[PDB]
Amino acid sequence: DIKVIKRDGRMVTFDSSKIYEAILKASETITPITPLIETKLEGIANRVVAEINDRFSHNIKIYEIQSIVEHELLEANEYAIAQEYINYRTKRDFERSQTINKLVNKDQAVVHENANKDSDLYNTQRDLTAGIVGKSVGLKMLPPHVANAHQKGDIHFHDLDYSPYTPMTNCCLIDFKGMLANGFKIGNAEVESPKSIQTATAQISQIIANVASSQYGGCTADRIDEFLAPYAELNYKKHLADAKEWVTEEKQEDYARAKTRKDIYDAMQSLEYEINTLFTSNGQTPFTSLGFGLGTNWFEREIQKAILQVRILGLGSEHRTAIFPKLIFTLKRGLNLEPNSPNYDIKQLALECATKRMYPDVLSYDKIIELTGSFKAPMGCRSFLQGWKDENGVEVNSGRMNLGVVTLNLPRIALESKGDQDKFWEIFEERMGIAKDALVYRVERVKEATPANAPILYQYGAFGQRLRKCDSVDQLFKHRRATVSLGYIGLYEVASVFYGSDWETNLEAKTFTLNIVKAMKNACESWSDEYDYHFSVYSTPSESLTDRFCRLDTEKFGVVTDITDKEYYTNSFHYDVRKNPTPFEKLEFEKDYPEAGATGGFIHYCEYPVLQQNPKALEAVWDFAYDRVGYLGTNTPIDKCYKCDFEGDFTPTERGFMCPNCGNTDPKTVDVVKRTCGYLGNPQARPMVKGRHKEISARVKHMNGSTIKYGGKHL
Amino acid sequence: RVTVNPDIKVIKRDGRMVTFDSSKIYEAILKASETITPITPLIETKLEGIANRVVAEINDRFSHNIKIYEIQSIVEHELLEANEYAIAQEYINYRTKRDFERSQATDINFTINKLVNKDQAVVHENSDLYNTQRDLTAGIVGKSVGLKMLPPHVANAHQKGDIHFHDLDYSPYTPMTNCCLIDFKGMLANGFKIGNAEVESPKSIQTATAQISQIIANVASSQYGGCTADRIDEFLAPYAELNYKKHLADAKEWVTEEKQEDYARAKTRKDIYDAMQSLEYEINTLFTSNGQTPFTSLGFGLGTNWFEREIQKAILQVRILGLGSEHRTAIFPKLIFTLKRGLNLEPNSPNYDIKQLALECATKRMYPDVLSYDKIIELTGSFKAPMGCRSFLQGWKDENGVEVNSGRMNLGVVTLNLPRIALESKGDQDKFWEIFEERMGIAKDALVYRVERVKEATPANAPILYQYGAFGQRLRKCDSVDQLFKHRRATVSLGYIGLYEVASVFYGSDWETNLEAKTFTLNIVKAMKNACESWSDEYDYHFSVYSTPSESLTDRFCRLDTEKFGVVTDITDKEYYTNSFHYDVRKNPTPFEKLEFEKDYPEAGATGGFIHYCEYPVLQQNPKALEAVWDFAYDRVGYLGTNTPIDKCYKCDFEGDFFMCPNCGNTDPKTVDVVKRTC
Ligand SMILES: Nc1ncnc2c1ncn2[C@H]1C[C@H](O)[C@@H](COP(=O)(O)OP(=O)(O)OP(=O)(O)O)O1
Ligand SMILES: Nc1ncnc2c1ncn2[C@H]1C[C@H](O)[C@@H](COP(=O)(O)OP(=O)(O)OP(=O)(O)O)O1
Ligand SMILES: Nc1ncnc2c1ncn2[C@H]1C[C@H](O)[C@@H](COP(=O)(O)OP(=O)(O)OP(=O)(O)O)O1
Ligand SMILES: Nc1ncnc2c1ncn2[C@H]1C[C@H](O)[C@@H](COP(=O)(O)OP(=O)(O)OP(=O)(O)O)O1
Ligand SMILES: Nc1ncnc2c1ncn2[C@H]1C[C@H](O)[C@@H](COP(=O)(O)OP(=O)(O)OP(=O)(O)O)O1
Ligand SMILES: Nc1ncnc2c1ncn2[C@H]1C[C@H](O)[C@@H](COP(=O)(O)OP(=O)(O)OP(=O)(O)O)O1
Ligand SMILES: [Mg+2]
Ligand SMILES: [Mg+2]
Ligand SMILES: [Mg+2]
Ligand SMILES: [Mg+2]
Ligand SMILES: [Zn+2]
Ligand SMILES: [Zn+2]
């Protein structure tokens, strides 16, 4: 290892952190450290070490290290941190021997957190430029008042990187049943109907990879155990015919049964791994959901079991938690909910999986039907289609899509209200009109698409009906077949402005938040009659919005107590994550909001401790939730550090998450899984924005218990 | 007066190694001083004393080369040692100003705002998928940024059409590499991380081929060129053997002892076919950010045992059968079959049955192309399949004396517009070699730049390549990627095109029979070979002569020359340039005549990339005729591709070469199967 020559002459040992901490001090003079800046600095620090060993062999001087640090800062295009580092380092060199320049424009004086030349994948880097062009051109395509409201922060026009630059749609339920049945053309090949479940799960992932790049939202395989089971019956028939030729007569049925079991497991094992190797143009994996649970026969049951035990096993030899696809298990009274039900053994398997992998989320078969008019898994994260029938009276769920999302900054309306609820509704009506204009423009823009733009969607069965190149894409959107999302956020903050930080026990406060949801549902019903598309109230995931709205409102209104001071906004109608109600009180409080009109999109979370050796505690919440809420997710500490074998809940810091036992943050040797919003995420692999990270750090547990499964060893 | 170590060379910012020149240091210090006070003899004495301390420190801190910023660091250091704080302040301020402005030429936010507003150009060509439409804007930005990053004389040469700097959409904006031979054998044996999964070694051939298609997808997004699975029948065989091992174990529990061996054999043969079927269909459903299928190749043929033979047959059987119910011809991956005397060449050879199958496949489809095992060894120093289209690695032993082929890559291509040089000569070969020497130097500056650019890549920019085995050795995040490029490990491509047009300028249309006309074209290849060998000794990367594929480059050079020189007879009047050294496409020599004429050019030094095309009417639907060409080619050329298959109209059921359809006139690509070579 190379030694370092100090300025006085003595030789010290190469301490790599002296480079990082130097760069850190220069960055902190511009803006406080964040998880995103942390990985940016660590990547730049690695390049410095690389250049040092590439340009020097036995020793290196201090000023030689300084010239590499400044050189690598300019090679990474970090002009703001470089200007600070160079001026300070130069000032100290002049002082030891006895500002220097200004060369950065207003837009380069800020640290760009989502752009790391030394850390990002190539396709991530090039797609970044496509998104900048797309957003810039897209802002001029919008109606100017809609574009102005987005820029100010009154509303949020979602997915500007993709829409309206392209007439892309949002999310959808892929009609896998129709596609796999008749075959389809994908890429250069036009495959035929699969003759086994292995070929079927292979075609599914290839369909997902294609759908993921024809739309800016997620996609779901609804009732996968049911449409996959016929292809697993082909496997049984195969193995049964093979048993006639080779196997003893007394063993032919056990042979075909045992081989088909392994085939089903291998097919779902392939679906798990292949989805985790797929990626869109930005380098990130596709946002995918698998829904299952309503199958009853042996093949449908085995597919359910194989999905869960694959997720339980984990990815690779380290058995890491699979973040994608999202698994959604359907609970149904009489099928798997009661201990006497035939599929109850699968419910106990899904309970084991949720205590080890957080997934699966659970749907209430009946409550979903009541809230949304029919049963289906949510499109992507949490978007629900409403009950809809075709011209022949046939119920149609899979094959339907969402056309776009626009979200209202509700806390802003409360902060502009100055404690006057009459002024709140006055501003609320104005903001609703802007959102209506934005949503109508989205519908017009998506209708300008052509079947040739996304053949997998419009021509080969993903949207249910196959169109010709001459047909209009609106044929699959009109008559309320497609949905349009009117989003919102921060009902807690809206109530805190008028009723204080402990309004949850105030009925008049609760009524206010419920009347806001009903008002949005009322307008959506009116818009749905005006334009004959299904507008619905959507509980927007706070993955990026919680930071953007809180950041823009802090500039406009300052540090408002309980609102902007915490640096995040509470998601939709959710309970204040800082308070600690029981999971039973939480679901009883929140259940009123989807019933009031928030049915276009919704979810419920609960924070548990380590539940791996206590699944019945989780089962009491699922059973309690069946009659009250439709979509329930389970959060439980399932992190793991592979340096000291610690398992539990990592301690959040200003830079991300570190091991509570040894302080390890290296994502190569830690498995940190947190619920971003609906989906799970790896905050050590892809760090979240500061606001999203603050909201995650503010979450308290809802039932007592230990957040440590394995304490770890002393290193 | 201190003398610099003569073993030290200055590495310019664009990668060029130049002679050390202490006057460059003195003049720099002088320019900073003149901004403060006029020069005086007393100041000169101080400035040349400082320059001496700079050269002494250089000799004290570096042994072989030194970068520009390392010299500047010493200049600023010694200025502060000499207590010339006024000069040092002016020098640092000016040097830092130029360093920032130089980095801002790679900034997107500056140029994207200009692209959408005022001065930057968008339409620069002289497509329905959304990801294609979004990728167009990424390439517009990349080409606009890339042109400002290149050395100015390289950019001017490219825009004028004197050279072609390949893949401006991707490099130098990103430090991406070009093509490679993926080291599948190392990845599959030791496991690897891909996406979010740290997968283990495959326990079956079905899992092996599934991991291959996913590796290919991830590699295809980490580079702008093709990738190749070399000797796929051989490294897949150990995984097909695992299928046999577990089938024989199941046979012991379910099958009677008399049938146990036949059970494991039959099931394993089916598993092999199913696995290769998946590889075929999964490759065709892959796509890069532009929506196109990644260019991929499978090389196979040298396997001998039962498992290797079955993998070869399965590959050819799947390709023969076609894609889908209509049995369309699969264009990707390219199949490259290895002929070898004693293994499958002559009718008595053990694998001759596979050659017969390959001949049937190449006739009914287009692929497999064939490689002469012996000729490739003679031309490239060792045996390996071409990376991507036709890029060949040279024979290379690693630091442990082991021959390495898979895991190596090409760093970029720059193609000389040779027909233009001939037209600029005005009939005088003396001016040709004069202009040829100049264009040669410009291409050298561009290739040196590409190597310097790809070395800026970090392992984290492409973990599948640098960290998880695609390039052989696995690097850490704090290592340099150059470890996998240097010591001639990676190749650099010097391209050319249009030897027919060049000779025709000085010798007329029918020069092929002129002995001195061919000697001239062969001297052009030899001049390129010798230059590349010299560049390889200078920079320690393998520069090689590359017969650039025509693609769209043959239209860019011809279109730009038509604007510059007009309609020249036999040159630009046909609206295309003949590829590299190939025989005139308008002339119709026999396959044996064509191969005898063309074999000299790889032998002359065009070995970094080459292929031989034969399009003879007798070869259509005639496996016997094709075998005559393969056999004749084995001892003469190294890489041969035969006829394209008949274009099929699925309506009206016509077969021919047609675009429209002679029997009806259909143009719908859904009911039409047209097969063309990508390169
Ligand atoms: N042991 C070391 N290993 C690697 N880099 C080092 C080491 N010590 C110092 N550096 C580098 C990192 C910075 O680029 C540069 C200045 O860092 P700094 O910690 O202030 O060093 P220093 O020698 O001035 O120490 P101090 O300020 O504590 O006296 O020196
Ligand atoms: N306030 C700051 N602004 C910008 N960069 C800073 C700041 N503080 C520290 N740094 C960076 C640049 C310094 O070279 C490096 C090491 O810090 P420091 O020890 O203060 O400086 P130094 O090593 O140049 O001088 P010295 O050791 O003589 O104090 O950290
Ligand atoms: N891995 C794959 N990915 C995508 N398509 C595939 C894959 N393997 C096969 N296909 C295509 C080829 C056919 O057009 C269609 C049916 O495949 P498959 O179920 O393997 O039937 P098959 O006709 O090859 O019969 P079998 O495998 O049962 O002998 O799917
Ligand atoms: N051949 C060389 N020998 C020694 N030092 C050199 C050489 N070329 C450049 N330098 C050093 C001297 C200065 O400290 C620094 C910048 O000098 P300069 O002549 O402007 O280089 P350059 O590569 O930027 O060229 P130019 O500005 O002419 O294009 O580089
Ligand atoms: N006007 C000046 N004031 C101060 N120092 C100067 C001035 N002109 C030149 N120098 C010094 C510092 C420069 O690094 C060095 C070489 O000059 P110059 O080639 O113009 O700069 P450079 O090499 O940093 O940039 P460029 O990228 O344009 O080559 O001489
Ligand atoms: N279709 C697939 N695509 C990608 N990786 C896969 C796929 N199937 C399995 N893998 C991964 C999982 C393991 O880490 C590794 C080995 O897979 P595999 O050979 O199926 O082993 P295994 O442990 O599942 O045993 P077996 O299949 O014999 O029961 O590859
Ligand atoms: Mg210091
Ligand atoms: Mg397996
Ligand atoms: Mg200069
Ligand atoms: Mg098959
Ligand atoms: Zn630890
Ligand atoms: Zn026809």
Residue numbers in the entry:
A (entry chain B): 14 to 111, 118 to 734
B (entry chain A): 8 to 133, 138 to 669, 676 to 696
The article reads:
Anaerobic class III RNRs (NrdDs), the subject of this study, use an oxygen-sensitive glycyl radical cofactor and are members of the glycyl radical enzyme (GRE) family. The activity of NrdD enzymes can be allosterically up-regulated by ATP and down-regulated by dATP. We find that StNrdD’s regulatory “cone” domains adopt markedly different conformations depending on whether the activator ATP or the inhibitor dATP is bound and that these different conformations alternatively position an “active site flap” toward the active site (ATP-bound) or away (dATP-bound).
An x-ray structure of StNrdD bound to dATP was determined to 2.6-Å resolution by soaking WT-StNrdD crystals in 10 mM CTP and 10 mM dATP. Two dATP molecules are bound in the cone domain of StNrdD as was observed recently for PcNrdD and discussed in detail below. We find one dATP molecule bound in the canonical allosteric activity site (site 1) as first identified in EcRNR. The most unexpected feature of this dATP-bound StNrdD crystal structure is the asymmetric arrangement of the cone domains compared to the dimeric protein core. The cone domains, which form an antiparallel dimeric unit, are tilted so they contact only one side of the core fold, the side of the NrdD dimer that contains the opening to the chain B active site within the 10-stranded barrel. The chain B cone domain sits close to the top of the chain B barrel, not only burying a relatively large surface area near the barrel edge (525 Å2) but also making contacts with chain A across a chain A–chain B interface (left side of dimer in Fig. 2B). We find that the chain B cone domain is near the opening of the chain B barrel but the cone domain is rotated, such that the C terminus end of helix 4 is pointing away from the barrel opening (~180° away), pulling the connector in the opposite direction from the active site. Here, the C terminus of the cone domain helix 4 is pointing in the correct direction toward the chain A active site, but the chain A cone domain is sitting on the opposite side of the NrdD dimer from the barrel opening and is thus too far away for the connector to reach the active site (right). The asymmetry of the dATP-bound structure is therefore part of the mechanism of inhibition.
